[PDB]
């Protein structure tokens with residue numbers, strides 16, 4: 001009942017929304033959360049994604065290839081059910097690990113665990129789904 005995101009995780013989610021808006025997408029999907037995690041730069045998830053080889057430009061391009069893009073949106077937009085499930089799962093992972101704060105690493109763990117959705121399609125297309133998981137797992141050791 002006291003589940004809470006770290007500041008970096010909150011920033012990543014804000015960036016996910018900002019990315020969707022930029023692309024004229026009114027629904028924030030797993031792909032936007034993934035791009036938000038990369039754009040956040042500082043957290044484990046960004047360091048994992050960059051280590052396995054993604055750039056912001058690549059992810060954005062793939063999102064556009066798959067979904068298209070429309071004019072920028074200025075009003076409020078919303079999380080898809082899968083995005084909501086991913087965020088709920090990130091809390092579940094943090095509680096399983098008995099950690100107080102849901103970080104970027106927990107959100108990326110949850111994206112991978114969820115297994116479906118555009119973010120996983122992009123990881124799979126790039127051939128780095130299991131490599132991303134491995135890198136995330138070692139980056140969470142200590």
Ligand SMILES: [Mg+2]
Nearest residue numbers: 006008103104
């Ligand atoms: Mg964090």
